[PDB]
């Protein structure tokens, strides 16, 4: 594909009275998950979730396991610090999420890096696009930003994101080339569903595509119907492909005013579908 991403995600959920926080982390290349770690699991190891990552040597699994375990300890500590910053009690359950990663173009060059945190589902602190400073969302996050500024955390993160992160993404794209580099276009069709004697539903289907990014839109007489389209979230089929549909409610006999438009990287040309019984 024309660009690629690697993303790591972690979630820590405190469990007051029930032991240490639950910690779940996953890594993705584009829309393909390839590793996980779950503090509840017996192995206490990072585990493969895509076949091509098993090409990595035993040192990889040892080193990554140590780093992910160390991160779970840091986030255990950070949940405690957050309670103090927000003056919250030890009785409630709270959530700390983190995401980092990089985007590279098809020429293999770094495009963008990310490093951010959310507490209880709200932005806490994030590395800005130039990777030189922080966006801190509230009063508590300014305390963190200050400390991170004095410790030069941004320079450490920038160096990882432009270096090791890019190197790892390029290696994974090589080892998993046969599956990771595909751009399988959607198979498309349209269905028609009478609602009453006055109205019917036209539904436009996109099936079997990868990667997940896609645009499905309805037009009436050449005009976007964004204000009237039922558009479901892109959803996994379970076999490595994705699905999506878009629907419009249509007055009886006016079906030919409407066209469905499909854009996907796997398509040579954008598609235009009409109801053609």
């Amino acid at each position: 594909a024309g660009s690629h991403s690697m993303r790591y995600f972690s979630t820590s959920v405190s469990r007051p009275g029930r032991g240490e926080p639950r910690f779940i982390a996953v890594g993705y290349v584009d829309d393909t998950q390839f590793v996980r770690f779950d503090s509840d699991a017996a192995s206490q190891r990072m585990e493969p979730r895509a076949p091509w990552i098993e090409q990595e040597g035993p040192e990889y699994w040892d080193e990554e396991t140590g780093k992910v375990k160390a991160h779970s300890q840091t986030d255990r500590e950070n949940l405690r610090i957050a309670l103090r910053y927000y003056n919250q009690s030890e009785a409630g359950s709270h959530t700390l999420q983190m995401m980092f990663g990089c985007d590279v173009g098809s020429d293999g060059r770094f495009l963008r890096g990310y490093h951010q945190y959310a507490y209880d589902g709200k932005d806490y602190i994030a590395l800005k696009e130039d990777l030189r400073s922080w966006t801190a969302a509230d009063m508590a996050a300014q305390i963190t930003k200050r400390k991170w500024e004095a410790a030069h955390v941004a320079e450490q993160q920038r160096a990882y994101l432009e270096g090791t992160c890019v190197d790892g993404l390029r290696r994974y794209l090589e080892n998993g080339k046969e599956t990771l580099q595909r751009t399988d276009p959607p198979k498309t069709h349209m269905t028609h569903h009478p609602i009453s004697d006055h109205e019917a539903t036209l539904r436009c289907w996109a099936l079997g595509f990868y990667p997940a990014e896609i645009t499905l839109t309805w037009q009436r007489d050449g005009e976007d119907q964004t204000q009237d389209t039922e558009l479901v979230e892109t959803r996994p089929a379970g076999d490595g492909t994705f699905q999506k549909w878009a629907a419009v409610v249509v007055p009886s006999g006016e079906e030919q005013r409407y066209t469905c438009h499909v854009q996907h990287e796997g398509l040579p040309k954008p598609l235009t579908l009409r109801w053609e019984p």
């Binding site: 840091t74 610090i81 957050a82």
Partner: peptide, 4 residues
Amino acid sequence: GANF
């Protein structure tokens, strides 16, 4: 790696 970094604490809050």
